[PDB]
Ligand binder design. Structure first.
Ligand SMILES: CNc1cc(C)nc(Nc2ccc(OC)c(OC[C@H](O)CN3CCC3)c2)n1
Ligand SMILES: C[S@@+](CC[C@H](N)C(=O)[O-])C[C@H]1O[C@@H](n2cnc3c(N)ncnc32)[C@H](O)[C@@H]1O
Ligand SMILES: [Zn+2]
Ligand SMILES: [Zn+2]
Ligand SMILES: [Zn+2]
Ligand SMILES: [Zn+2]
Length: 272
């Protein structure tokens, strides 16, 4: 049973790098029951505030590496090192909101505070897992704090999320208050839609603002939470909102010693 290259690039050239699909496990064809999009899309009236006069922006004439950069200060500080990687001290538990530089800023497009807006740089692969369907793995080593990819899909309201038949591809956009919105990657999504849950995760979501600062719509950036080895499967914690609903349909197959959502773990808690 050989590992076969089934698609040279599921992103159809929309990313900085190709994202190939292989399958060495079963007869599943390349997934095509969805539309690959590299950036979030709208299917109803959202009115994202794109007023350029509403952007907070810096007056930096350097590379935005100084603590005097307004955009960094909105983020508490800029959290990216000279190489575009999150600082070791970054709060991976309760990440702060990141405000990247933007088109109102006086700085250049290559300033130090533009990691997420610059897109995917690591080589990834869509591959058939043993027990969890499709998954995404690294084709190279990835240091801690590296930007991996964005959780991209269809923006929907809370009310629309409430009636979506498939709730498997939802991501909540947390905001101080208000109407609350979700990304649904079921019908429209990028590579992130294929990232599985791991009880021992190696990536974390961070809310980021770039070309707009409409707080209803943070963009969701995945960064590595530790060093990742070539071939390693990417995964994040889907959280209890997911597992509270899904546990009765199926159980976690992440296979970790720490697995908290396996059949075994659920039964042990049922039993108390
Ligand atoms: C069903 N109505 C709503 C409404 C709002 C505002 N938010 C949600 N969130 C939600 C519902 C179900 C979910 O999984 C079963 C869920 O999972 C979130 C979790 O991040 C996992 N997704 C899978 C890819 C990321 C979120 N649902
Ligand atoms: C966002 S999709 C991830 C991509 C999915 N594996 C696929 O093939 O399209 C989430 C769904 O993948 C599966 N999945 C993800 N993480 C899992 C896990 N730890 N154990 C079992 N199934 C998992 C479940 O069917 C889940 O509802
Ligand atoms: Zn600046
Ligand atoms: Zn800048
Ligand atoms: Zn700036
Ligand atoms: Zn698990």
């Amino acid at each position: 049973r050989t590992e076969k290259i089934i698609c040279r690039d599921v992103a159809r050239g929309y990313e900085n790098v190709p994202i190939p699909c292989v399958n060495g496990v079963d007869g599943e064809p390349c997934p095509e029951d969805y539309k690959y999009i590299s950036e979030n899309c709208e299917t109803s009236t959202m009115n994202i505030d794109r007023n350029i006069t509403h952007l907070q922006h810096c007056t930096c004439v350097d590379d935005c590496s100084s603590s005097n950069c307004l955009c960094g200060q909105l983020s508490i500080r800029c959290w990216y090192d000279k190489d575009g990687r999150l600082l070791q001290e970054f709060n991976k538990i309760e990440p702060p909101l990141i405000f990247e530089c933007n088109q109102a800023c006086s700085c250049w497009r290559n300033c130090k505070n533009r990691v997420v807006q610059s897109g995917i740089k690591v080589r990834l692969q869509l591959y058939r897992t043993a027990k969890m369907g499709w998954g995404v793995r690294a084709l190279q080593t990835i240091p801690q704090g590296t930007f991996i990819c964005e959780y991209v899909g269809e923006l929907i309201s809370d009310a629309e999320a409430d009636v979506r038949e498939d709730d498997s591809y939802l991501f909540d956009l947390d905001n101080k208050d208000g109407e609350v919105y979700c990304i649904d990657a079921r019908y429209y999504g990028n590579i992130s839609r294929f990232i599985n849950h791991l009880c021992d995760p190696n990536i974390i979501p961070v809310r980021v603002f770039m070309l707009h600062q409409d707080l209803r719509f943070p963009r969701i950036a995945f960064f590595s939470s530790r060093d990742i080895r070539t071939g390693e499967e990417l995964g994040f914690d889907y959280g209890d909102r997911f597992w509270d609903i899904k546990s009765k349909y199926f159980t976690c197959q992440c296979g970790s010693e720490k697995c908290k959502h396996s059949a075994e773990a659920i039964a042990l808690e049922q039993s108390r």
